[PDB]
Design a protein around this nucleic acid. Sequence first.
RNA 1: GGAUAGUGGCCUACCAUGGUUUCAACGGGUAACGGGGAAUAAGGGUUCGAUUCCGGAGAGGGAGCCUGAGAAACGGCUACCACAUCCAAGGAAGGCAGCAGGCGCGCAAAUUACCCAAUCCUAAUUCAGGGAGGUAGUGACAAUAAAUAACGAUACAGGGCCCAUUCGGGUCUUGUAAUUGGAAUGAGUACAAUGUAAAUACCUUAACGAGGAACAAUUGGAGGGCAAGUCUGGUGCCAGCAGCCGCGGUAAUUCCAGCUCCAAUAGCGUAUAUUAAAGUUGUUGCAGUUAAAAAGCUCGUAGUUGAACUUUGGGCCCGGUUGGCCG
Lengths: 184, 67, 57, 144
Amino acid sequence: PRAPRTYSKTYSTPKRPYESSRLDAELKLAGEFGLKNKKEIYRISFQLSKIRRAARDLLTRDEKDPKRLFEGNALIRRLVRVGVLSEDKKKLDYVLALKVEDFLERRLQTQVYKLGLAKSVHHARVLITQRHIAVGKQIVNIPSFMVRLDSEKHIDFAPTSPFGGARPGRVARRNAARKAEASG
Amino acid sequence: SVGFGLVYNSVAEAKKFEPTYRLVRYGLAEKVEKASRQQRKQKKNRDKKIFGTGKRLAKKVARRNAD
Amino acid sequence: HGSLARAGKVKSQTPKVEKTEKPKKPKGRAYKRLLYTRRFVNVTLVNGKRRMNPGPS
Amino acid sequence: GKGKPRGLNSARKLRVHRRNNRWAENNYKKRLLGTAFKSSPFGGSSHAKGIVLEKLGIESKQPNSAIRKCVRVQLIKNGKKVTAFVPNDGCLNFVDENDEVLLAGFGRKGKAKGDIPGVRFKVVKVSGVSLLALWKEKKEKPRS
RNA sequence: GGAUAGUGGCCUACCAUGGUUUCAACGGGUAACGGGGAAUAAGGGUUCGAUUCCGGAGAGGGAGCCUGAGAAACGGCUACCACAUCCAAGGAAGGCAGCAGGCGCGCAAAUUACCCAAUCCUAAUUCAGGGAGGUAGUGACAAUAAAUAACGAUACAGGGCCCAUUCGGGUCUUGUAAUUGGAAUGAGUACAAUGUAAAUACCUUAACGAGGAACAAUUGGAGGGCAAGUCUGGUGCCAGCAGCCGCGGUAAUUCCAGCUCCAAUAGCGUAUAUUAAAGUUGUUGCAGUUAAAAAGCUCGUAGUUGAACUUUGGGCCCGGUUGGCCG
């Protein structure tokens, strides 16, 4: 018989659904960081809880233990690679105290808006879902990318995208045809 | 795009080693069309039920039908 | 007993009000932005309870 | 000594005591006695099927004055008679009689919900057509 | 001693009353195949495991056997038993808890397709055979990503600073239109090629290809729990809502219906279980005067527990650490 293929969940519905404070705060963060849905904050909180629990069960063990050293170094290396934390802080206080807002204000969706090549987080989302933007060599169509500064070093536009040339486009072609018909 | 590619030293080795379906797809060979899986399996079932060549059985059946 | 009748009386006597024509709401990435605008730019009722859906006075 | 033994060799006594005192909880007792499998009329199933028999106009319990107008259903897997509530406004004329009706629970682990006495199951679909669809007129039950 | 591939009351001939048992034997039930494991995790835990791998049993219920190295073999045989097929009325022919499919059953579960090419198996083991296996189809059990068009130019729900020709205007409009429209996108077809046994489950250069009656999105609620309307019409303890408290008897924020809001987004609602909740199973860690609960009292076997003491004690050296009175 077919060997099993594993799947996993990525988001956690909070224990109580109706908090006039929690719901309101998560609505603020979703609106101010350009998040179309609530399951996205749910999953980002799931990852944050996972990493915080890893830090907690790492810290509960005594100092200088080689397992602790290795796990902490690997976690710090991954977190530096993603870049949400300054690369000159090894006290682990910031990685344990990392909040959802701090985590979200580093992913590429905020980066494009703050650099100004989209002028709107919603406009950036539509550009990504329409595929007229490539972070690097390969054209991307997913809003949740979490660049690791590789795309920052390789910042450019998609080849078959506006301002990339080599293609007027369908709407531009029909507009030109209509203008030619009107002129003569 | 990314794929696999293999170059043989000669057409003889290419024909010997390449799979038959691959040769048919490329055009280097062709496999004669035959009956479908169910039909050939049914043929094998019938001639496994039949014992012997079957010519004598057919002749006996024809003789019995005649008389 | 004896009331095994008049099933859905108000259901029957309810006047059939049809559906009003209205522009379609934009759902997806738009809806969260519309709620953002409807909630955080609206400051009309902040006197004593910070109401969000005021009834027509 | 707080009652219960506190010795390093009292695991047997503690386990036996817990085993005997677990029978005081309704859920554990019913689960291990299989009452829901045998004594319950759904046969330990979330949903059941049956044939509507007649109409029941049982009255509400105080403080209330209304007729719930349920139906009588004879189940198919075991043949037991039950009284099944018809939830929505004007679903009686849809679930009238002589139909292959599908029945569900109420939501109280086998108890009556509100002012309806003696009823524990409700009609959710009849003759292959949902009571909700009939109520909302999205699709109508065939006459045959 | 026999039999077995050999151990063995495995089976026979000959002694004692031998073996198990309140530390639960034996018997009964299991809506019991046992494991790795599945669901929450502060911990300790409570349920589930038919099912993707291992081991065992069966291939209608039983038994008994040939060949074979290996079978109590059933897509091998023999006989009897819930079945069931074919006669020109003697006889013969099995068995899908294997694939597909049907019947019955039930709340509940797929096409009577294609291939041996990715994987392996068997054979004279090399050119064959494999419903094992793989491909497609159905159906949204789960699971990851995620569309329902941004926006230039002006009319305001009324916003920051200056010329201070003082409540007339300007390098950016926080945010609305039945005005004009600036680069754009997938689905459905695909002069075209790519995934596969050339063919549709991944792309693109294509051509048809959004302009808001457009390629239009709902499930239930808005008294509380629990965020969310004393806004209107209808009914009037009726019809109905209602997880519980409750609403409705002529001003119903709760019923039916039109504008607004929520869990979520193609996913939500309901039912039955189970986990946290539950320190309402309490080993951690519950209560017993009155809320349920200290046997009427005492003795006593099993069980649990059970004063204190025995080398408690000092001197020197050194393989090894310390952010070290050390950069």
